[PDB]
Design a protein around this ligand. Structure first.
Ligand SMILES: NC(=O)C1=CN([C@@H]2O[C@H](COP(=O)(O)OP(=O)(O)OC[C@H]3O[C@@H](n4cnc5c(N)ncnc54)[C@H](OP(=O)(O)O)[C@@H]3O)[C@@H](O)[C@H]2O)C=CC1
Ligand SMILES: CCc1nc(N)nc(N)c1-c1ccccc1
Length: 215
């Protein structure tokens, strides 16, 4: 069965256009994907975007007590054949990239993917897992609404490669910036755009919110 559907595994990210270079066999000035800029020097390519930060927080925070049961029954069902909050999953780099005055992300169950970190090290309240396999084990015995994959690059890749992504909330940052991290490529035929928001202006830079769903 589609584990992404059974455990509501979604992906949420923001990407901007990549700024050119001058020398490197990697500069993709004609990439078929205009918005693929994910990070730069362990940080977001652009500056604190309040409009997107608000969005990300509303989407990853929102829970609907009502619709839970139907989810609960779905999982209880799948399991035999073998406070409400969403889960947020992030790679170690992304986790370390987040300023302390934000970790752990509030109103959300925090999970970090790592092979090095340990409980003695990390003092914040977050589950540490060593593989997507262990992520499924955790989800299997955890009570949550939706599960959001929030980065970085390596975590997106693995999940899209295993077809563990049911939906992708993609913010398009209409601006070019230097980037050393890009959104991993995936077969776009298995998805279709289901939501295309109106345009927004954050201090002059525009941005929109697209939502893809698995076919
Ligand atoms: N624009 C956006 O929406 C987002 C941008 N970013 C940006 O992306 C960049 C970070 O991305 P990237 O460098 O790819 O890093 P990631 O955040 O994916 O973290 C990489 C690390 O996560 C761990 N990890 C990845 N896969 C697994 C796995 N299967 N099992 C266990 N651990 C795993 C490893 O930790 P370990 O080495 O300890 O084993 C690994 O080295 C930053 O610049 C950040 O700011 C991040 C999220 C979103
Ligand atoms: C607010 C920036 C942001 N916007 C969107 N649309 N998606 C994301 N995944 C993030 C993000 C990036 C790194 C760490 C935590 C969240």
């Amino acid at each position: 069965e589609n584990l992404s559907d059974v455990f509501d595994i979604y992906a949420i990210c923001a990407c901007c256009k990549v700024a050119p270079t001058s020398e490197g066999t990697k500069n993709e000035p004609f990439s078929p994907r205009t918005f693929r800029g994910l990070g730069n020097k362990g940080t977001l390519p652009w500056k604190c975007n309040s409009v997107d930060m608000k969005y990300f927080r509303s989407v990853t925070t929102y829970v609907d007590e009502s619709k839970y049961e139907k989810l609960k029954w779905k999982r209880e069902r799948y399991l035999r054949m073998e406070k409400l909050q969403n889960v947020v999953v992030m790679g170690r780099s992304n986790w370390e990239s987040i300023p302390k005055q934000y970790k752990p992300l509030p109103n959300r169950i925090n999970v970090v993917l790592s092979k090095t970190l340990t409980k003695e090290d990390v003092k914040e309240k977050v589950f540490i897992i060593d593989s997507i396999d262990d992520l499924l084990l955790l989800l299997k015995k955890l009570k949550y609404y939706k599960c959001f994959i929030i980065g970085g690059a390596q975590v997106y890749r693995e999940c899209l490669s295993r077809n563990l992504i049911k939906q992708i909330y993609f913010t398009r940052i209409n601006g070019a910036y230097p980037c050393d991290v890009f959104f991993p490529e995936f077969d776009e035929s298995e998805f279709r755009v289901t939501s295309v928001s109106e345009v927004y202006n954050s201090k002059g830079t525009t941005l929109d919110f697209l939502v893809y769903s698995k076919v």
